[PDB]
Design a protein around this motif. Structure first.
Motif, PDB file in Angstrom:
ATOM      1  N   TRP A 124     -10.673   1.301  -3.406  1.00 31.75           N
ATOM      2  CA  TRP A 124      -9.377   0.563  -2.658  1.00 31.75           C
ATOM      3  C   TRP A 124      -8.569   1.408  -1.616  1.00 31.75           C
ATOM      4  O   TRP A 124      -8.224   2.647  -1.990  1.00 31.75           O
ATOM      5  CB  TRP A 124      -8.844  -0.257  -3.339  1.00 31.75           C
ATOM      6  CG  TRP A 124      -8.149  -1.270  -2.522  1.00 31.75           C
ATOM      7  CD1 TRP A 124      -6.797  -1.039  -1.626  1.00 31.75           C
ATOM      8  CD2 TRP A 124      -8.388  -2.576  -2.234  1.00 31.75           C
ATOM      9  NE1 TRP A 124      -6.633  -2.068  -1.100  1.00 31.75           N
ATOM     10  CE2 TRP A 124      -7.593  -3.300  -1.453  1.00 31.75           C
ATOM     11  CE3 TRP A 124      -9.435  -3.389  -2.818  1.00 31.75           C
ATOM     12  CZ2 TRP A 124      -7.466  -4.469  -0.974  1.00 31.75           C
ATOM     13  CZ3 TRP A 124      -9.379  -4.908  -2.512  1.00 31.75           C
ATOM     14  CH2 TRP A 124      -8.447  -5.354  -1.519  1.00 31.75           C
ATOM     15  N   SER A 125      -8.666   0.968  -0.525  1.00 28.49           N
ATOM     16  CA  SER A 125      -8.119   1.616   0.830  1.00 28.49           C
ATOM     17  C   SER A 125      -6.862   2.723   0.562  1.00 28.49           C
ATOM     18  O   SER A 125      -6.901   3.538   0.029  1.00 28.49           O
ATOM     19  CB  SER A 125      -7.929   0.397   1.829  1.00 28.49           C
ATOM     20  OG  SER A 125      -9.237  -0.094   1.963  1.00 28.49           O
ATOM     21  N   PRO A 126      -5.847   2.263   1.261  1.00 27.35           N
ATOM     22  CA  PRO A 126      -4.787   2.943   0.369  1.00 27.35           C
ATOM     23  C   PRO A 126      -4.716   2.228  -0.923  1.00 27.35           C
ATOM     24  O   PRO A 126      -5.055   1.010  -1.069  1.00 27.35           O
ATOM     25  CB  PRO A 126      -3.469   2.923   1.086  1.00 27.35           C
ATOM     26  CG  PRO A 126      -3.968   2.454   2.513  1.00 27.35           C
ATOM     27  CD  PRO A 126      -5.191   1.848   2.529  1.00 27.35           C
ATOM     28  N   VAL A 152       0.749  -1.331  -0.065  1.00 32.51           N
ATOM     29  CA  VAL A 152      -0.104  -0.149  -0.096  1.00 32.51           C
ATOM     30  C   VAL A 152       0.764   1.316   0.065  1.00 32.51           C
ATOM     31  O   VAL A 152       2.012   1.112   0.514  1.00 32.51           O
ATOM     32  CB  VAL A 152      -0.837   0.203   1.160  1.00 32.51           C
ATOM     33  CG1 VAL A 152      -2.016  -1.175   1.015  1.00 32.51           C
ATOM     34  CG2 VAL A 152      -0.173  -0.157   2.652  1.00 32.51           C
ATOM     35  N   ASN A 175     -10.001  -8.514   2.732  1.00 31.95           N
ATOM     36  CA  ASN A 175     -10.240  -7.989   4.154  1.00 31.95           C
ATOM     37  C   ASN A 175      -9.184  -6.837   4.491  1.00 31.95           C
ATOM     38  O   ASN A 175      -9.331  -6.363   5.404  1.00 31.95           O
ATOM     39  CB  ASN A 175     -10.089  -9.127   5.016  1.00 31.95           C
ATOM     40  CG  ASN A 175      -9.950  -8.700   6.527  1.00 31.95           C
ATOM     41  OD1 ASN A 175      -8.902  -8.627   7.197  1.00 31.95           O
ATOM     42  ND2 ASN A 175     -11.130  -8.163   7.243  1.00 31.95           N
ATOM     43  N   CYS A 176      -8.357  -6.550   3.457  1.00 30.73           N
ATOM     44  CA  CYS A 176      -7.330  -5.668   3.587  1.00 30.73           C
ATOM     45  C   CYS A 176      -7.824  -4.473   3.344  1.00 30.73           C
ATOM     46  O   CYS A 176      -7.326  -3.430   2.605  1.00 30.73           O
ATOM     47  CB  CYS A 176      -5.952  -5.933   2.676  1.00 30.73           C
ATOM     48  SG  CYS A 176      -4.540  -5.463   3.518  1.00 30.73           S
ATOM     49  N   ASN A 177      -9.152  -4.041   3.548  1.00 32.84           N
ATOM     50  CA  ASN A 177      -9.635  -2.790   2.953  1.00 32.84           C
ATOM     51  C   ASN A 177     -10.037  -1.737   4.053  1.00 32.84           C
ATOM     52  O   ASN A 177     -11.155  -1.760   4.702  1.00 32.84           O
ATOM     53  CB  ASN A 177     -10.835  -3.106   2.160  1.00 32.84           C
ATOM     54  CG  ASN A 177     -10.867  -2.538   0.526  1.00 32.84           C
ATOM     55  OD1 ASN A 177      -9.874  -1.480   0.472  1.00 32.84           O
ATOM     56  ND2 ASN A 177     -11.603  -3.009  -0.333  1.00 32.84           N
ATOM     57  N   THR A 178      -9.160  -0.866   4.320  1.00 33.43           N
ATOM     58  CA  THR A 178      -9.483   0.405   5.072  1.00 33.43           C
ATOM     59  C   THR A 178     -10.598   1.119   4.584  1.00 33.43           C
ATOM     60  O   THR A 178     -11.447   1.571   5.225  1.00 33.43           O
ATOM     61  CB  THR A 178      -8.041   1.328   5.005  1.00 33.43           C
ATOM     62  OG1 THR A 178      -7.449   1.014   6.206  1.00 33.43           O
ATOM     63  CG2 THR A 178      -8.511   2.567   5.117  1.00 33.43           C
ATOM     64  N   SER A 179     -10.622   1.121   3.133  1.00 31.89           N
ATOM     65  CA  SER A 179     -11.782   2.091   2.670  1.00 31.89           C
ATOM     66  C   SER A 179     -13.080   1.369   3.084  1.00 31.89           C
ATOM     67  O   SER A 179     -13.622   0.215   3.238  1.00 31.89           O
ATOM     68  CB  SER A 179     -11.892   2.024   1.081  1.00 31.89           C
ATOM     69  OG  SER A 179     -12.988   2.244   0.457  1.00 31.89           O
ATOM     70  N   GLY A 180     -13.966   2.600   3.326  1.00 30.97           N
ATOM     71  CA  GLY A 180     -15.484   2.161   3.651  1.00 30.97           C
ATOM     72  C   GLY A 180     -16.080   2.058   2.555  1.00 30.97           C
ATOM     73  O   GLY A 180     -16.847   1.063   2.399  1.00 30.97           O
ATOM     74  N   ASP A 220       4.022   3.218   2.447  1.00 26.27           N
ATOM     75  CA  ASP A 220       4.658   1.943   3.142  1.00 26.27           C
ATOM     76  C   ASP A 220       5.972   1.714   2.313  1.00 26.27           C
ATOM     77  O   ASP A 220       5.890   1.476   1.054  1.00 26.27           O
ATOM     78  CB  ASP A 220       3.808   0.751   3.171  1.00 26.27           C
ATOM     79  CG  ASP A 220       4.504  -0.389   4.161  1.00 26.27           C
ATOM     80  OD1 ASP A 220       5.665  -0.496   4.239  1.00 26.27           O
ATOM     81  OD2 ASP A 220       3.594  -0.717   5.021  1.00 26.27           O
TER      82      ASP A 220
END
Ligand code: DCP
Ligand code: CA
Ligand code: CA
Length: 424
Positions: free
Chosen positions: A407-409, A364, A397-402, A367
DNA sequence: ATGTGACGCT
DNA sequence: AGCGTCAAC
């Protein structure tokens, strides 16, 4: 405490990817050229460089556009792109061409796509029994350098005299002479290098010594199209001005803190220290390993393993291009799982085996670490859609995004890798 | 914005 | 098992 039991060689192809393209496209022969990856961004990333171009200052990692500023004539061959990604099939196939030939002489350990170590000890023992107790002609060693020789008028001139001083001082009727064995390995290596160039058209260099590290360091001393014998006796002089970073294993952080903690610069300076001193400084394994190594002693064996233990595909999505929708994530996982499937199917059919574990890995943005999450997964069928669906699942499950479509970062990297092989 | 594969450690 | 290091693949 000799460290002269074995005879080991490291063969490594000269500017390998370049040579593979030059064999295919005669126009590239004997010219400044480079192999480039992805021509869009700054003309493409250069990954291999012919020696002619090197004389202009062109290097690996250099951007092709930047390389052309040093070298206006520079010719470029481009890496094949399948499924939106750099594909290396041609070089991997050229690699097994060399690896197979090379296997005809002894058992090899594939060190990379490009190089392999050889334990020549047994083959050396056998060849002596024909040369009972006959000498060795310089004629049998037409491309061999003897490191440290001559001692006591232009390039090829000097190679010649070094070889003669070496052959003259050689104890021929003794068949346990370490130096004689190295010489016998060198002749064998002349032959396997002549077999490679004959049957593939590729040139390489080789290092001949008593262990893997010396072999490897020896190999780079006279490059290209040359081989170098590094004997036990030559080690104190070679090492005395040999920057520590140059020995395999010591080119990173451990080597950087050998220098740090000890206040030294060259490999020979390690001899002052006791084994216990080095162990306290770098660990039991690293202490013992360095103590022996600075004296030219090393015991890592030549593993009998010609083929890779993992097959893997990765792609980076730097900055702007980072993946931020999940349809985007799924598409590349599929592309990757596709290259992977074909590489795997070829493998079960070529090398008679099946992989059983699937490793998925991502990065991501924000990092700097080489990875960011690796998870393993079962690999029950060589089906690209299943693998890409399973890979998703282990990272879904690696999804910070609501919001459930973005996608999250955004992701800087995707990596799929087949592993845990078993006989088929 | 350089872009495989091995092994060590815990 | 998942992370790190290394070199260079
Ligand atoms: N960071 C790297 C290193 C190498 N390779 C590929 C291109 C190389 O041609 C081949 C072999 O790598 P080497 O480090 O042995 O270098 P070369 O064979 O290109 O040149 P040399 O004659 O210096 O060994 O693997 C690559 O893609 N990326
Ligand atoms: Ca090489
Ligand atoms: Ca190499």
């Amino acid at each position: 405490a000799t460290g002269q039991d074995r005879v080991v060689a490291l063969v490594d192809m000269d500017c390998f990817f370049v040579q593979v393209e030059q064999r295919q496209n005669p126009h590239l022969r004997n010219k400044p050229c480079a192999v480039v990856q992805y021509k869009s961004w700054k003309g493409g990333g250069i990954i291999a460089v012919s020696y002619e171009a090197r004389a202009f200052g062109v290097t690996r990692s250099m951007w092709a556009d930047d390389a052309k500023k040093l070298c206006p004539d520079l010719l470029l061959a481009q890496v094949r792109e399948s499924r939106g990604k750099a594909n290396l099939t041609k070089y991997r196939e050229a690699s097994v061409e060399v690896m197979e030939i090379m296997s005809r002489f002894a058992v090899i350990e594939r060190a990379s796509i490009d190089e392999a170590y050889v334990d020549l000890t047994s083959a050396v023992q056998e060849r002596l029994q024909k040369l009972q107790g006959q000498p060795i002609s310089a004629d049998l060693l037409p491309s061999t350098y003897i490191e440290g020789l001559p001692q006591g008028v232009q390039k090829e001139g000097m190679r010649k005299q070094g070889l003669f001083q070496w052959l003259d001082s050689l104890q021929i009727d003794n068949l346990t002479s370490p130096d004689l064995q190295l010489t016998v390995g060198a002749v064998i290596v002349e032959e396997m290098r002549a077999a490679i160039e004959r049957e593939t058209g590729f040139q390489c260099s080789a290092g001949i010594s008593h262990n893997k590290v010396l072999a490897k360091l020896a190999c780079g001393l006279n490059k290209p199209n040359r081989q170098t014998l590094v004997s036990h006796g030559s080690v104190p002089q070679l090492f005395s001005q040999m920057p520590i970073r140059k020995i395999r294993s010591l080119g990173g952080k451990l080597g950087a803190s050998v220098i740090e903690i000890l206040g030294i610069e060259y490999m020979g300076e390690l001899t002052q220290f006791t084994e216990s001193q080095l162990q306290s400084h770098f660990g039991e394994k690293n202490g013992s390993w360095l103590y022996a190594m600075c004296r030219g002693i090393e015991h890592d064996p030549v593993k009998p393993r010609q083929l890779p233990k993992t097959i893997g595909c990765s792609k980076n999505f730097p900055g702007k291009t980072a993946l931020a929708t999940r349809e985007q994530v799924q598409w590349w996982l599929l592309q990757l799982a596709q290259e992977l499937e074909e590489r795997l199917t070829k493998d079960r059919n070529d090398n008679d085996r099946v992989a059983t574990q699937l490793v998925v890995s991502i990065r991501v943005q924000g990092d700097k670490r080489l990875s960011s999450l690796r998870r393993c997964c079962a690999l029950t069928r060589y089906d690209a859609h299943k693998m890409s669906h399973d890979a998703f699942t282990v990272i879904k499950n690696c999804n910070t995004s609501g919001i459930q479509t973005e996608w999250s970062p955004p992701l800087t990297m995707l990596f799929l890798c087949a592993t845990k092989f078993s006989a088929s």
